[PDB]
Amino acid sequence: MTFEVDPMDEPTLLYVLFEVFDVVRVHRPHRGVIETVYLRTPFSAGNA
Amino acid sequence: LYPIPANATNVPISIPSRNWAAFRGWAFTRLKTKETPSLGSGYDPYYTYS
Amino acid sequence: YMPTIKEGNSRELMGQQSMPNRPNYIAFRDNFIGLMYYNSTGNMGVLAGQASQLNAVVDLQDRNTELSYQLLLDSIGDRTRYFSMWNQAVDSYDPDVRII
Amino acid sequence: NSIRYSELAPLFDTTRVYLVDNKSTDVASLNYQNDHSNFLTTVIQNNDYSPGEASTQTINLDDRSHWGGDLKTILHTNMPNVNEFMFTNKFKARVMVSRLPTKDNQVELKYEWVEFTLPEGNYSETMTIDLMNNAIVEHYLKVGRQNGVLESDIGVKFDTRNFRLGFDPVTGLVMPGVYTNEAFHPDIILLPGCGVDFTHSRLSNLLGIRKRQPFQEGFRITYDDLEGGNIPALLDVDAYQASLPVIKPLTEDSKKRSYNLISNDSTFTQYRSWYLAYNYGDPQTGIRSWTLLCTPDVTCGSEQVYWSLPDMMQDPVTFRSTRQISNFPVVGAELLPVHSKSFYNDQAVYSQLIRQFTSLTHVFNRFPENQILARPPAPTITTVSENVPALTDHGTLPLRNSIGGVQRVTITDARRRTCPYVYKALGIVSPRVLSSRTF
């Protein structure tokens, strides 16, 4: 991606929201046990 | 967060190579480095802004 | 306006003129942004079982949990209303001050 | 078998994942307040992204298997002898504060336990005892002499020699009239009402004075505790040959610094010695009953360090999963790499005499005419602390089935805190299958 911005006399940033599917599935199979499986995509990270 | 130098115009970014399955779209806004703290740490010492 | 650099009292210090200081509102942020370590992977919070050693909060760096809650309150309800318990008072400039 | 990574092909068993502190600088936004003991490093090491953009991705071991990693760690420190962190600069010692007279024909002595701090640095055991004797005089030059306490009654003196080699038991004095200039062991020298306190200190391990029962709290050595260890007085050899048979215990010096004798008609001084009460006192009830003679050990003890990888190792038995910076689940124990290497020269006292002429200053050689308050002899058997690297094998450790990209390495002290003097940490984990988790 190639952006063109107006010039500013200050160090500025660029905040791009790459919209993903940041999804949790919480599984509590026993009493006192909580175990989640995470998945996000395209920026892939999680248990799935 | 991509850095833009002072008085810069062309900002080329590059996501290197990823599986883009189920991509949804973009949304972007220019921020300032002065007004954006470096999150991830217990304390940002280079952040003199409130 | 200081007419004379000398700190001692003189006739010229009857002409010194006073201006009020700029109004500075220091408060907690809207929806208590900044109190909680979200998305800091070194200060990541825990919700797990007491005997279970597996954390159910696997928080990442490039997630923005604060902005995900600011945009959530916009859609699920009115945002011009003030809720003091979560300190839910949205940042809002005056429309006659920004755009003259 | 699959050690599957998301952005590449699924590898199979026995890969290597690396936890290096150099890549904890590649992601510097996480660790602005983290040393090389406790730090957040990355593991992913995919060269497509950035030094820091690949940190969020995970390494998923398979959930069907129970995984075990062969931990191999490289540790290297630069720890000085005298430092604030390992409690080797502080020692408490009760000293004589003020010698002031009362109304009629009575003097009253004021005492106070004063905290004595050493300059931080890597020293020998000759110069540290010179610094430990310097802190007694620095309190004397600041608090002591401004009230009126004399030079003869400076309380605590850290010496390294024997005061009972010229001792003739028929006469009761030291026959050469000068104590020997050879060093045997570091002892302490006290006066009535003064003592030391090595409870929160660790220079007790430097003087070679350890407890016979170390598991009780508190370690103070008092004038009352050193019973039977009076330093014998010196024979007046200038008068023993002037009338040659007269026998006189020596009372003063060339500068009239009087030896503290217990009376006018005695052969012992008021100066005690830890070395004399240990070897020549009572073995049943004396200081030998609860102290111990040691190698002087310029490392000041070798504690252990505790490796802990909380975000990829499963916690061992009876360890609770917690995120406290002082308390992590320990996955590997290791000795601190500061070894103590020996050293021997027979000219260690003669090299100390050149050391005064080279330094050109009498700071360490204050009181040169007084025999007890003279500079201690350097020992012929010293010790040299060496920082050695330590590649160790922590064996197979059970792994968490989903390893995140950012991983914490914490090198924890024996008192459960982070060591500032670690500057090289490198963990190497080899994941392999231990047993199946599903039938």
From Swiss-Prot, chain B:
Disulfide bond annotation, renumbered to this chain: none
Annotated signal peptide: none
UniProt subcellular location: Virion; Host nucleus
Upper taxonomic lineage: Viruses, Varidnaviria, Bamfordvirae, Preplasmiviricota, Tectiliviricetes
Protein task: Major capsid protein that self-associates to form 240 hexon trimers, each in the shape of a hexagon, building most of the pseudo T=25 capsid. Assembled into trimeric units with the help of the chaperone shutoff protein. Transported by pre-protein VI to the nucleus where it associates with other structural proteins to form an empty capsid. Might be involved, through its interaction with host dyneins, in the intracellular microtubule-dependent transport of incoming viral capsid to the nucleus.
Family the UniProt entry places it in: Belongs to the adenoviridae hexon protein family.
Induction (free text): Expressed in the late phase of the viral replicative cycle.
Subunit and partners: Homotrimer. Interacts with the capsid vertex protein; this interaction binds the peripentonal hexons to the neighboring penton base. Interacts with the hexon-linking protein; this interaction tethers the hexons surrounding the penton to those situated in the central plate of the facet. Interacts with the hexon-interlacing protein; this interaction lashes the hexons together. Interacts with host dyneins DYNC1LI1 and DYNC1I2; this interaction might be involved in intracellular microtubule-dependent transport of incoming viral capsid.
Residues of the full protein shown: 653 to 702 of 952
Miscellaneous remark of the record: All late proteins expressed from the major late promoter are produced by alternative splicing and alternative polyadenylation of the same gene giving rise to non-overlapping ORFs. A leader sequence is present in the N-terminus of all these mRNAs and is recognized by the viral shutoff protein to provide expression although conventional translation via ribosome scanning from the cap has been shut off in the host cell.
Record's protein name: Hexon protein
Top-level lineage group: Viruses
Swiss-Prot record, chain D:
Subunit structure: Interacts (via the cell attachment site RGD) with host heterodimer ITGAV-ITGB5; this interaction promotes virus internalization. Interacts with host WWP1 and WWP2. Interacts with the fiber protein (via N-terminal tail region). Interacts with the capsid vertex protein; this interaction binds the penton base to neighboring peripentonal hexons.
Protein's UniProt keywords contain Cytoplasm: no
Subcellular location: Virion; Host nucleus
Swiss-Prot/TrEMBL domain comment: The cell attachment RGD motif is exposed at the virion surface and is involved in binding to the integrin heterodimer ITGAV-ITGB5.
Main location: virion
Entries under InterPro entries matching the protein: Adeno_Penton_B
Keywords: Capsid protein, Clathrin-mediated endocytosis of virus by host, Host nucleus, Host-virus interaction, Late protein, T=25 icosahedral capsid protein, Viral attachment to host cell, Viral penetration into host cytoplasm, Virion, Virus endocytosis by host, Virus entry into host cell
Pfam families membership: Adeno_Penton_B
GO molecular function, one term: structural molecule activity
Species lineage: Viruses, Varidnaviria, Bamfordvirae, Preplasmiviricota, Tectiliviricetes
Function: Major capsid protein that self-associates to form penton base pentamers, each in the shape of a pentagon, situated at the 12 vertices of the pseudo T=25 capsid. Involved in virus secondary attachment to host cell after initial attachment by the fiber protein. Binds host integrin heterodimer ITGAV-ITGB5 (alphaV-beta5) thereby triggering clathrin-mediated endocytosis of virions. Mediates initial virus attachment to CXADR-negative cells. Binding to integrins ITGAV-ITGB5 also seems to induce macropinocytosis uptake of the virus.
Protein name: Penton protein
Gene3D superfamilies linked to this entry: adenovirus 2 penton base, domain 2, Penton protein, domain 1
GO cellular component: host cell nucleus; T=25 icosahedral viral capsid; viral capsid
GO terms (BP aspect): clathrin-dependent endocytosis of virus by host cell; virion attachment to host cell
Superkingdom of origin organism: Viruses
Other information: All late proteins expressed from the major late promoter are produced by alternative splicing and alternative polyadenylation of the same gene giving rise to non-overlapping ORFs. A leader sequence is present in the N-terminus of all these mRNAs and is recognized by the viral shutoff protein to provide expression although conventional translation via ribosome scanning from the cap has been shut off in the host cell.
Organism of provenance: Human adenovirus C serotype 5
Family from the record: Belongs to the adenoviridae penton family.
Induction comment from the UniProt entry of this chain: Expressed in the late phase of the viral replicative cycle.
